[PDB]
């Protein structure tokens, strides 16, 4: 039991370190997709506005 409980807690610790590292990596990868999109929408709305303004 002393070997079993010591080795468990350790196992949880290892999984949680790797789980947190995977989550933080996913946050930077997702964050860039959001920024890429925000830049994209802004350009679209501006070009539709100016296309109608050029027509009229």
């Amino acid at each position: 039991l002393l070997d079993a409980k010591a080795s468990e807690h350790a196992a949880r610790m290892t999984a949680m370190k790797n789980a947190t590292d995977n989550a933080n990596e996913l946050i930077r990868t997702l964050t860039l997709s959001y920024n890429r999109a925000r830049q994209a929408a802004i350009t679209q709305e501006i070009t539709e506005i100016v296309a109608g303004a050029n027509a009229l």
Partner: peptide, 14 residues
């Protein structure tokens, strides 16, 4: 509104 009716040039969210 008081500009776009006087035809001033626009930018960003107009």
């Amino acid at each position: 509104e008081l500009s776009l009716l006087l035809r001033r040039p626009p930018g960003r969210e107009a």
